[PDB]
Protein backbone atom coordinates (compact mmCIF):
# COMPACT_ATOMS: atom_id res chain seq x y z
CA UNK A 1 0.00 0.00 0.00
CA UNK A 2 3.06 2.31 0.17
CA UNK A 3 6.64 2.64 -1.04
CA UNK A 4 9.62 0.64 0.27
CA UNK A 5 12.16 2.07 2.71
CA UNK A 6 15.04 0.20 1.04
CA UNK A 7 15.00 2.56 -1.96
CA UNK A 8 12.79 5.40 -0.65
CA UNK A 9 13.98 7.97 -3.18
CA UNK A 10 13.52 6.83 -6.77
CA UNK A 11 17.21 6.87 -7.73
CA UNK A 12 16.99 3.54 -9.55
CA UNK A 13 15.00 4.38 -12.76
CA UNK A 14 13.24 1.03 -12.19
CA UNK A 15 9.84 1.14 -13.94
CA UNK A 16 9.13 4.88 -13.96
CA UNK A 17 8.46 4.66 -17.70
CA UNK A 18 5.91 1.92 -16.96
CA UNK A 19 4.00 4.59 -15.01
CA UNK A 20 3.59 6.48 -18.29
CA UNK A 21 3.61 3.73 -20.95
CA UNK A 22 -0.06 2.83 -20.49
CA UNK A 23 -2.93 2.04 -18.12
CA UNK A 24 -0.67 2.92 -15.18
CA UNK A 25 -0.18 6.18 -17.08
CA UNK A 26 -3.62 7.10 -15.74
CA UNK A 27 -2.33 6.48 -12.18
CA UNK A 28 1.01 8.29 -12.42
CA UNK A 29 2.28 10.61 -9.69
CA UNK A 30 2.41 14.20 -10.97
CA UNK A 31 4.15 15.37 -7.79
CA UNK A 32 7.66 16.75 -7.31
CA UNK A 33 9.92 14.15 -5.72
CA UNK A 34 11.85 15.48 -2.71
CA UNK A 35 15.18 13.72 -2.15
CA UNK A 36 17.46 13.80 0.87
CA UNK A 37 20.43 11.55 -0.03
CA UNK A 38 21.24 12.11 -3.74
CA UNK A 39 20.40 15.01 -6.02
CA UNK A 40 20.80 14.52 -9.80
CA UNK A 41 18.91 17.84 -9.99
CA UNK A 42 18.83 21.37 -8.54
CA UNK A 43 15.70 21.47 -6.36
CA UNK A 44 16.95 18.70 -4.07
CA UNK A 45 20.41 20.27 -4.15
CA UNK A 46 18.94 23.48 -2.72
CA UNK A 47 17.10 21.51 -0.01
CA UNK A 48 20.47 20.27 1.29
CA UNK A 49 22.99 23.10 0.89
CA UNK A 50 20.77 25.84 2.32
CA UNK A 51 20.39 26.33 6.06
CA UNK A 52 17.19 28.43 6.29
CA UNK A 53 16.72 29.54 9.90
Amino acid sequence: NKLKEEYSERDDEELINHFKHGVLYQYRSEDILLRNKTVHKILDEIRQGVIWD
Partner: protein, 475 residues
Protein backbone atom coordinates in the same frame (compact mmCIF):
# COMPACT_ATOMS: atom_id res chain seq x y z
CA UNK B 1 23.47 22.39 -14.82
CA UNK B 2 26.14 23.36 -12.30
CA UNK B 3 26.41 23.26 -8.51
CA UNK B 4 28.89 26.15 -8.32
CA UNK B 5 29.50 27.41 -4.78
CA UNK B 6 31.12 30.76 -3.99
CA UNK B 7 31.70 32.95 -0.92
CA UNK B 8 30.16 36.44 -0.38
CA UNK B 9 33.54 38.10 -0.43
CA UNK B 10 33.99 37.21 -4.13
CA UNK B 11 31.18 39.54 -5.19
CA UNK B 12 33.46 42.30 -3.81
CA UNK B 13 35.46 41.98 -6.98
CA UNK B 14 34.95 44.67 -9.73
CA UNK B 15 33.39 48.12 -9.09
CA UNK B 16 29.78 47.02 -9.60
CA UNK B 17 29.49 44.25 -6.93
CA UNK B 18 27.74 42.13 -9.63
CA UNK B 19 26.83 38.51 -8.85
CA UNK B 20 25.24 37.02 -11.96
CA UNK B 21 26.05 33.37 -12.55
CA UNK B 22 28.31 33.83 -15.59
CA UNK B 23 30.71 36.37 -14.02
CA UNK B 24 31.03 34.31 -10.84
CA UNK B 25 31.64 31.28 -13.05
CA UNK B 26 34.54 33.14 -14.66
CA UNK B 27 36.14 34.44 -11.44
CA UNK B 28 37.72 31.30 -9.87
CA UNK B 29 40.68 31.37 -7.47
CA UNK B 30 43.94 32.15 -9.24
CA UNK B 31 47.55 31.25 -8.46
CA UNK B 32 49.24 31.97 -11.78
CA UNK B 33 50.19 35.31 -13.35
CA UNK B 34 47.72 38.18 -13.64
CA UNK B 35 48.60 41.15 -15.86
CA UNK B 36 46.05 43.90 -16.49
CA UNK B 37 45.10 46.07 -19.46
CA UNK B 38 48.17 48.23 -18.72
CA UNK B 39 51.06 46.24 -20.22
CA UNK B 40 49.15 45.36 -23.41
CA UNK B 41 46.39 47.43 -25.03
CA UNK B 42 44.83 50.83 -24.30
CA UNK B 43 41.26 52.00 -24.88
CA UNK B 44 40.93 54.98 -27.24
CA UNK B 45 38.16 57.58 -26.75
CA UNK B 46 35.78 58.12 -29.64
CA UNK B 47 35.84 61.19 -31.88
CA UNK B 48 33.81 62.76 -34.67
CA UNK B 49 35.56 62.47 -38.06
CA UNK B 50 35.82 65.24 -40.66
CA UNK B 51 33.77 63.72 -43.48
CA UNK B 52 34.39 65.19 -46.93
CA UNK B 53 31.14 65.90 -48.80
CA UNK B 54 32.57 65.36 -52.28
CA UNK B 55 33.77 61.73 -52.54
CA UNK B 56 32.18 58.35 -51.80
CA UNK B 57 33.36 57.18 -48.37
CA UNK B 58 32.77 53.83 -46.64
CA UNK B 59 30.92 52.70 -43.53
CA UNK B 60 30.65 49.53 -41.49
CA UNK B 61 28.00 48.25 -39.07
CA UNK B 62 28.27 45.18 -36.82
CA UNK B 63 26.33 43.07 -39.32
CA UNK B 64 28.66 44.25 -42.07
CA UNK B 65 31.45 42.46 -40.19
CA UNK B 66 31.73 38.67 -40.04
CA UNK B 67 32.90 36.12 -37.48
CA UNK B 68 36.14 35.92 -39.48
CA UNK B 69 36.92 39.63 -39.11
CA UNK B 70 36.21 40.42 -42.77
CA UNK B 71 34.52 43.81 -43.03
CA UNK B 72 32.11 44.35 -45.95
CA UNK B 73 31.71 48.14 -46.05
CA UNK B 74 28.97 49.97 -47.90
CA UNK B 75 29.66 53.00 -50.09
CA UNK B 76 27.70 56.16 -49.26
CA UNK B 77 28.10 59.51 -50.98
CA UNK B 78 26.14 62.38 -49.28
CA UNK B 79 24.91 63.22 -52.79
CA UNK B 80 22.33 60.39 -52.84
CA UNK B 81 20.47 60.69 -49.51
CA UNK B 82 17.99 58.05 -50.66
CA UNK B 83 15.25 57.06 -48.24
CA UNK B 84 16.49 53.44 -48.39
CA UNK B 85 19.86 54.36 -46.85
CA UNK B 86 18.48 57.43 -45.04
CA UNK B 87 18.88 55.62 -41.71
CA UNK B 88 22.63 55.30 -42.26
CA UNK B 89 23.00 59.00 -43.09
CA UNK B 90 20.87 59.97 -40.09
CA UNK B 91 22.92 57.88 -37.66
CA UNK B 92 26.11 59.31 -39.18
CA UNK B 93 24.83 62.86 -38.68
CA UNK B 94 23.91 61.88 -35.12
CA UNK B 95 27.55 61.15 -34.32
CA UNK B 96 27.73 57.36 -34.52
CA UNK B 97 30.80 57.35 -36.78
CA UNK B 98 34.56 57.31 -36.26
CA UNK B 99 37.72 56.39 -38.18
CA UNK B 100 40.29 53.84 -36.94
CA UNK B 101 43.89 55.01 -36.65
CA UNK B 102 45.58 52.27 -38.72
CA UNK B 103 46.76 49.79 -36.06
CA UNK B 104 43.87 49.44 -33.62
CA UNK B 105 41.82 46.27 -33.18
CA UNK B 106 38.13 47.15 -33.22
CA UNK B 107 35.95 45.01 -30.95
CA UNK B 108 32.15 44.91 -31.10
CA UNK B 109 30.31 45.67 -27.86
CA UNK B 110 26.99 43.95 -28.60
CA UNK B 111 27.21 40.14 -28.41
CA UNK B 112 31.02 39.72 -28.31
CA UNK B 113 30.87 35.92 -28.71
CA UNK B 114 30.40 36.18 -32.48
CA UNK B 115 34.10 37.03 -32.98
CA UNK B 116 33.46 40.46 -34.46
CA UNK B 117 37.02 41.49 -33.59
CA UNK B 118 38.54 43.10 -36.69
CA UNK B 119 42.04 44.41 -37.46
CA UNK B 120 42.91 47.67 -39.21
CA UNK B 121 46.29 46.65 -40.60
CA UNK B 122 49.06 49.24 -40.74
CA UNK B 123 49.99 49.04 -44.44
CA UNK B 124 46.64 49.52 -46.18
CA UNK B 125 44.48 52.10 -47.97
CA UNK B 126 40.79 52.90 -48.71
CA UNK B 127 40.02 54.13 -45.20
CA UNK B 128 36.72 52.81 -43.84
CA UNK B 129 34.67 54.34 -41.03
CA UNK B 130 33.02 52.45 -38.18
CA UNK B 131 30.15 52.66 -35.69
CA UNK B 132 30.66 53.74 -32.08
CA UNK B 133 29.50 50.22 -31.16
CA UNK B 134 33.11 49.24 -31.89
CA UNK B 135 35.89 49.65 -29.34
CA UNK B 136 39.21 51.11 -30.50
CA UNK B 137 41.68 49.16 -28.38
CA UNK B 138 44.98 50.05 -30.13
CA UNK B 139 47.75 47.87 -28.67
CA UNK B 140 51.41 48.25 -27.71
CA UNK B 141 52.64 44.68 -28.38
CA UNK B 142 52.03 44.61 -32.17
CA UNK B 143 48.49 44.49 -33.59
CA UNK B 144 48.75 40.99 -35.08
CA UNK B 145 49.90 39.45 -31.79
CA UNK B 146 46.99 40.86 -29.79
CA UNK B 147 44.50 40.18 -32.59
CA UNK B 148 45.39 36.49 -32.79
CA UNK B 149 45.60 36.27 -28.99
CA UNK B 150 42.06 37.67 -28.73
CA UNK B 151 40.29 35.87 -31.59
CA UNK B 152 40.83 32.20 -30.72
CA UNK B 153 42.20 32.25 -27.17
CA UNK B 154 41.08 34.88 -24.63
CA UNK B 155 37.50 34.33 -25.78
CA UNK B 156 36.02 32.44 -22.80
CA UNK B 157 36.76 35.54 -20.70
CA UNK B 158 35.73 38.42 -22.96
CA UNK B 159 32.39 36.59 -23.25
CA UNK B 160 32.13 36.21 -19.46
CA UNK B 161 32.00 39.93 -18.65
CA UNK B 162 29.03 40.74 -20.87
CA UNK B 163 25.95 42.54 -19.55
CA UNK B 164 22.82 40.48 -20.18
CA UNK B 165 20.54 42.97 -18.42
CA UNK B 166 16.99 42.28 -19.64
CA UNK B 167 18.01 42.33 -23.28
CA UNK B 168 21.13 42.67 -25.36
CA UNK B 169 24.31 40.79 -24.49
CA UNK B 170 26.66 43.73 -24.42
CA UNK B 171 30.34 44.37 -23.69
CA UNK B 172 31.49 47.52 -21.89
CA UNK B 173 34.92 49.13 -22.16
CA UNK B 174 35.13 49.53 -18.38
CA UNK B 175 34.62 45.79 -17.93
CA UNK B 176 36.98 45.20 -20.86
CA UNK B 177 39.68 47.00 -18.84
CA UNK B 178 39.56 44.26 -16.17
CA UNK B 179 40.37 40.90 -17.83
CA UNK B 180 43.23 38.91 -16.26
CA UNK B 181 45.22 37.96 -19.40
CA UNK B 182 47.91 35.39 -18.59
CA UNK B 183 51.52 36.21 -19.49
CA UNK B 184 52.54 32.74 -20.71
CA UNK B 185 50.19 33.27 -23.66
CA UNK B 186 51.71 36.61 -24.69
CA UNK B 187 55.20 35.57 -23.57
CA UNK B 188 55.20 32.45 -25.75
CA UNK B 189 53.38 34.17 -28.61
CA UNK B 190 55.85 37.07 -28.77
CA UNK B 191 58.70 34.57 -28.35
CA UNK B 192 57.61 32.93 -31.62
CA UNK B 193 56.60 36.28 -33.16
CA UNK B 194 59.21 36.23 -35.93
CA UNK B 195 57.77 33.12 -37.63
CA UNK B 196 54.17 33.00 -36.40
CA UNK B 197 53.29 36.16 -38.32
CA UNK B 198 55.07 34.76 -41.38
CA UNK B 199 53.27 31.42 -41.59
CA UNK B 200 49.93 32.93 -40.56
CA UNK B 201 50.37 35.50 -43.33
CA UNK B 202 51.06 32.67 -45.78
CA UNK B 203 47.92 30.85 -44.63
CA UNK B 204 45.71 33.93 -44.94
CA UNK B 205 47.23 34.71 -48.34
CA UNK B 206 46.18 31.22 -49.43
CA UNK B 207 42.73 31.90 -47.96
CA UNK B 208 42.53 35.15 -49.94
CA UNK B 209 43.54 33.28 -53.09
CA UNK B 210 40.77 30.73 -52.51
CA UNK B 211 38.23 33.49 -51.82
CA UNK B 212 39.22 35.37 -54.98
CA UNK B 213 37.83 32.52 -57.12
CA UNK B 214 34.99 31.49 -54.79
CA UNK B 215 31.58 31.69 -56.47
CA UNK B 216 28.08 31.47 -55.04
CA UNK B 217 26.11 28.22 -54.97
CA UNK B 218 23.22 29.77 -56.95
CA UNK B 219 24.94 31.74 -59.72
CA UNK B 220 26.44 28.51 -61.07
CA UNK B 221 22.93 27.11 -61.49
CA UNK B 222 21.96 30.55 -62.82
CA UNK B 223 24.66 30.81 -65.51
CA UNK B 224 24.67 27.35 -67.13
CA UNK B 225 20.93 27.46 -67.79
CA UNK B 226 21.50 31.01 -69.04
CA UNK B 227 24.52 29.97 -71.15
CA UNK B 228 22.81 26.87 -72.60
CA UNK B 229 19.34 28.18 -73.51
CA UNK B 230 20.74 31.39 -75.09
CA UNK B 231 18.80 33.81 -72.90
CA UNK B 232 20.35 37.16 -72.00
CA UNK B 233 20.83 37.70 -68.27
CA UNK B 234 20.07 41.44 -68.27
CA UNK B 235 16.44 41.49 -69.46
CA UNK B 236 14.48 38.94 -67.41
CA UNK B 237 15.70 40.88 -64.37
CA UNK B 238 14.76 44.08 -66.23
CA UNK B 239 11.38 42.86 -67.47
CA UNK B 240 10.63 41.65 -63.92
CA UNK B 241 11.16 45.24 -62.70
CA UNK B 242 8.39 47.04 -64.60
CA UNK B 243 5.03 46.48 -62.88
CA UNK B 244 2.08 47.54 -65.03
CA UNK B 245 0.70 44.18 -66.16
CA UNK B 246 -2.54 44.69 -68.10
CA UNK B 247 -4.83 41.79 -69.02
CA UNK B 248 -8.31 41.32 -70.42
CA UNK B 249 -11.24 39.27 -69.18
CA UNK B 250 -10.76 36.61 -71.86
CA UNK B 251 -7.16 35.88 -70.87
CA UNK B 252 -8.27 35.07 -67.31
CA UNK B 253 -9.71 31.68 -68.27
CA UNK B 254 -6.76 30.53 -70.40
CA UNK B 255 -5.10 27.54 -68.70
CA UNK B 256 -6.53 28.71 -65.38
CA UNK B 257 -8.95 25.99 -64.22
CA UNK B 258 -9.74 27.79 -60.93
CA UNK B 259 -10.30 31.34 -62.26
CA UNK B 260 -7.35 33.05 -60.58
CA UNK B 261 -6.91 36.75 -61.38
CA UNK B 262 -4.23 37.88 -58.95
CA UNK B 263 -1.55 40.24 -60.24
CA UNK B 264 1.30 37.79 -59.66
CA UNK B 265 -0.44 35.15 -61.78
CA UNK B 266 -0.67 37.56 -64.71
CA UNK B 267 2.97 38.59 -64.32
CA UNK B 268 3.92 34.90 -64.30
CA UNK B 269 2.05 34.48 -67.58
CA UNK B 270 3.89 37.51 -68.99
CA UNK B 271 7.32 36.18 -67.97
CA UNK B 272 6.55 32.73 -69.39
CA UNK B 273 5.91 34.40 -72.75
CA UNK B 274 9.50 35.71 -72.56
CA UNK B 275 11.40 32.70 -71.19
CA UNK B 276 10.11 30.53 -74.07
CA UNK B 277 10.36 32.83 -77.11
CA UNK B 278 13.27 30.91 -78.66
CA UNK B 279 13.22 27.68 -76.62
CA UNK B 280 11.18 24.94 -78.32
CA UNK B 281 11.32 22.17 -75.74
CA UNK B 282 8.34 22.90 -73.48
CA UNK B 283 6.19 19.96 -72.39
CA UNK B 284 3.53 19.83 -69.66
CA UNK B 285 4.87 18.33 -66.45
CA UNK B 286 1.50 16.80 -65.60
CA UNK B 287 1.98 13.89 -67.99
CA UNK B 288 5.43 13.08 -66.56
CA UNK B 289 4.33 12.89 -62.89
CA UNK B 290 3.19 9.51 -61.57
CA UNK B 291 2.45 10.32 -57.91
CA UNK B 292 2.70 13.02 -55.25
CA UNK B 293 2.98 12.75 -51.46
CA UNK B 294 3.46 15.38 -48.76
CA UNK B 295 5.14 13.89 -45.69
CA UNK B 296 4.56 13.88 -41.95
CA UNK B 297 5.29 16.81 -39.63
CA UNK B 298 4.49 16.03 -35.99
CA UNK B 299 5.56 18.14 -33.05
CA UNK B 300 9.35 18.07 -32.85
CA UNK B 301 11.95 18.78 -30.17
CA UNK B 302 15.32 20.23 -31.14
CA UNK B 303 18.14 17.83 -30.32
CA UNK B 304 15.79 15.41 -28.59
CA UNK B 305 15.07 11.68 -28.70
CA UNK B 306 13.21 9.96 -31.53
CA UNK B 307 13.10 9.71 -35.31
CA UNK B 308 14.90 12.66 -36.95
CA UNK B 309 12.95 15.08 -39.14
CA UNK B 310 14.22 17.36 -41.90
CA UNK B 311 13.41 21.03 -42.34
CA UNK B 312 13.25 23.55 -45.15
CA UNK B 313 16.84 24.58 -44.40
CA UNK B 314 18.07 21.22 -45.75
CA UNK B 315 17.11 22.02 -49.36
CA UNK B 316 19.93 23.83 -51.18
CA UNK B 317 20.24 25.29 -54.66
CA UNK B 318 22.19 22.23 -55.78
CA UNK B 319 19.76 19.34 -56.12
CA UNK B 320 21.37 17.45 -53.23
CA UNK B 321 19.68 16.84 -49.88
CA UNK B 322 21.61 18.23 -46.92
CA UNK B 323 20.33 15.26 -44.82
CA UNK B 324 21.52 16.97 -41.64
CA UNK B 325 18.47 16.60 -39.36
CA UNK B 326 18.07 18.76 -36.26
CA UNK B 327 14.53 18.13 -35.00
CA UNK B 328 13.62 14.73 -33.56
CA UNK B 329 10.12 13.43 -32.87
CA UNK B 330 8.71 10.59 -30.78
CA UNK B 331 5.18 10.30 -32.21
CA UNK B 332 3.78 7.45 -34.29
CA UNK B 333 1.30 7.32 -37.17
CA UNK B 334 0.87 3.54 -37.84
CA UNK B 335 2.18 4.30 -41.36
CA UNK B 336 5.52 5.95 -40.57
CA UNK B 337 7.35 3.77 -43.10
CA UNK B 338 5.68 5.70 -45.93
CA UNK B 339 7.80 8.77 -45.04
CA UNK B 340 11.40 7.63 -44.40
CA UNK B 341 13.07 9.48 -47.32
CA UNK B 342 15.34 6.77 -48.88
CA UNK B 343 17.81 7.48 -51.68
CA UNK B 344 16.66 8.60 -55.12
CA UNK B 345 13.59 10.66 -54.22
CA UNK B 346 12.85 14.13 -55.59
CA UNK B 347 11.61 16.59 -52.96
CA UNK B 348 10.16 19.94 -53.97
CA UNK B 349 9.71 22.55 -51.24
CA UNK B 350 6.12 23.57 -50.44
CA UNK B 351 6.07 26.53 -48.07
CA UNK B 352 8.74 29.23 -47.82
CA UNK B 353 9.34 32.85 -48.81
CA UNK B 354 8.30 34.12 -52.23
CA UNK B 355 11.85 33.46 -53.48
CA UNK B 356 12.74 30.18 -51.72
CA UNK B 357 9.57 28.31 -52.75
CA UNK B 358 9.81 25.45 -55.23
CA UNK B 359 13.46 24.56 -54.55
CA UNK B 360 13.77 20.85 -55.33
CA UNK B 361 16.47 18.43 -54.24
CA UNK B 362 17.44 14.84 -55.01
CA UNK B 363 18.48 12.57 -52.15
CA UNK B 364 21.94 11.58 -53.40
CA UNK B 365 23.24 10.48 -49.98
CA UNK B 366 23.14 6.87 -48.78
CA UNK B 367 21.69 6.82 -45.25
CA UNK B 368 20.78 3.65 -43.35
CA UNK B 369 18.79 5.69 -40.81
CA UNK B 370 15.10 6.40 -41.37
CA UNK B 371 14.51 10.15 -41.61
CA UNK B 372 11.06 11.70 -41.96
CA UNK B 373 10.33 14.57 -44.32
CA UNK B 374 7.75 17.14 -43.18
CA UNK B 375 4.39 18.25 -44.53
CA UNK B 376 6.37 21.13 -46.05
CA UNK B 377 7.87 18.84 -48.73
CA UNK B 378 6.28 17.23 -51.78
CA UNK B 379 7.70 13.93 -53.03
CA UNK B 380 7.59 13.60 -56.81
CA UNK B 381 7.88 10.17 -58.45
CA UNK B 382 8.41 10.95 -62.13
CA UNK B 383 9.22 8.64 -65.03
CA UNK B 384 12.98 8.12 -65.05
CA UNK B 385 13.04 7.99 -68.85
CA UNK B 386 12.37 11.57 -70.02
CA UNK B 387 13.03 14.04 -67.18
CA UNK B 388 16.24 12.94 -65.39
CA UNK B 389 15.23 13.94 -61.82
CA UNK B 390 18.50 15.75 -61.06
CA UNK B 391 17.95 17.98 -64.08
CA UNK B 392 14.41 18.71 -62.86
CA UNK B 393 15.73 19.72 -59.44
CA UNK B 394 18.37 21.95 -61.04
CA UNK B 395 15.70 23.55 -63.24
CA UNK B 396 13.51 24.16 -60.18
CA UNK B 397 16.47 25.82 -58.46
CA UNK B 398 17.23 27.80 -61.64
CA UNK B 399 15.63 31.07 -62.71
CA UNK B 400 13.09 28.94 -64.59
CA UNK B 401 11.99 27.56 -61.22
CA UNK B 402 12.25 30.99 -59.56
CA UNK B 403 10.42 33.38 -61.90
CA UNK B 404 7.53 30.89 -61.99
CA UNK B 405 7.08 29.81 -58.36
CA UNK B 406 7.67 33.42 -57.29
CA UNK B 407 4.47 34.42 -59.12
CA UNK B 408 2.19 31.34 -59.16
CA UNK B 409 2.32 30.09 -55.59
CA UNK B 410 -0.61 30.98 -53.36
CA UNK B 411 -1.47 32.14 -49.86
CA UNK B 412 -2.51 35.28 -48.02
CA UNK B 413 0.61 35.18 -45.81
CA UNK B 414 3.37 35.83 -48.34
CA UNK B 415 5.94 35.04 -45.64
CA UNK B 416 5.01 31.32 -45.83
CA UNK B 417 4.15 31.14 -49.52
CA UNK B 418 3.03 27.62 -50.44
CA UNK B 419 2.66 25.66 -53.68
CA UNK B 420 0.10 22.95 -54.43
CA UNK B 421 -0.21 19.96 -56.74
CA UNK B 422 -2.11 22.07 -59.28
CA UNK B 423 0.88 24.33 -59.96
CA UNK B 424 3.13 21.27 -60.25
CA UNK B 425 0.84 19.51 -62.75
CA UNK B 426 0.18 22.71 -64.75
CA UNK B 427 3.87 23.57 -65.19
CA UNK B 428 5.17 24.03 -68.75
CA UNK B 429 8.87 23.41 -68.26
CA UNK B 430 11.29 23.19 -71.21
CA UNK B 431 12.41 19.58 -71.60
CA UNK B 432 15.10 19.10 -74.25
CA UNK B 433 16.04 15.63 -75.54
CA UNK B 434 17.88 13.30 -73.16
CA UNK B 435 21.01 14.07 -75.19
CA UNK B 436 20.81 17.76 -74.27
CA UNK B 437 20.20 16.81 -70.66
CA UNK B 438 23.10 15.20 -68.76
CA UNK B 439 25.13 18.05 -70.31
CA UNK B 440 23.71 20.93 -68.27
CA UNK B 441 23.89 18.48 -65.41
CA UNK B 442 27.46 17.30 -65.25
CA UNK B 443 28.69 20.77 -66.14
CA UNK B 444 26.83 22.15 -63.12
CA UNK B 445 27.90 19.10 -61.12
CA UNK B 446 31.61 19.66 -61.82
CA UNK B 447 31.40 23.42 -61.27
CA UNK B 448 29.65 23.03 -57.90
CA UNK B 449 31.99 20.17 -56.99
CA UNK B 450 34.94 22.48 -57.58
CA UNK B 451 33.26 25.25 -55.57
CA UNK B 452 32.69 22.81 -52.70
CA UNK B 453 36.26 21.50 -53.00
CA UNK B 454 37.37 25.06 -52.43
CA UNK B 455 35.03 25.44 -49.47
CA UNK B 456 36.84 23.11 -47.05
CA UNK B 457 40.30 24.39 -47.97
CA UNK B 458 39.17 27.79 -46.66
CA UNK B 459 37.92 26.08 -43.51
CA UNK B 460 41.15 24.12 -43.38
CA UNK B 461 43.59 27.04 -43.42
CA UNK B 462 41.25 29.06 -41.20
CA UNK B 463 41.45 26.10 -38.80
CA UNK B 464 45.20 25.67 -39.31
CA UNK B 465 45.70 29.25 -38.13
CA UNK B 466 43.70 28.52 -34.97
CA UNK B 467 45.45 25.23 -34.19
CA UNK B 468 48.89 26.79 -34.78
CA UNK B 469 48.00 29.66 -32.44
CA UNK B 470 46.77 27.19 -29.83
CA UNK B 471 49.93 25.07 -30.08
CA UNK B 472 52.33 28.03 -29.94
CA UNK B 473 50.53 29.65 -27.00
CA UNK B 474 50.53 26.28 -25.17
CA UNK B 475 54.22 25.44 -25.65
Amino acid sequence: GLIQRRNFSTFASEPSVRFDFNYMKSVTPTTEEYYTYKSLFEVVPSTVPTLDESEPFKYAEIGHVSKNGEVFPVTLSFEDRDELNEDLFKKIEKGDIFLPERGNILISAIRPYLNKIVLIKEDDKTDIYFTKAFIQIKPLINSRILYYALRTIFSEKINAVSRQGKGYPTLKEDDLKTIQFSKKVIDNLLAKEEELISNIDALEKDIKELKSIQRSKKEIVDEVFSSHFNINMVELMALDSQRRVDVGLSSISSLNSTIRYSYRWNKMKLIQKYLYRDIDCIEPLGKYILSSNNGWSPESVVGGEGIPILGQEHLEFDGVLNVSPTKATTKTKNNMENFFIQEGDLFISRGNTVDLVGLACVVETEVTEDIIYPDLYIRLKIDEKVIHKKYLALLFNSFFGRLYFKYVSKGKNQTMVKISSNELLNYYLPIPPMEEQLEIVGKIEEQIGAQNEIEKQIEEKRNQIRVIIEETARS
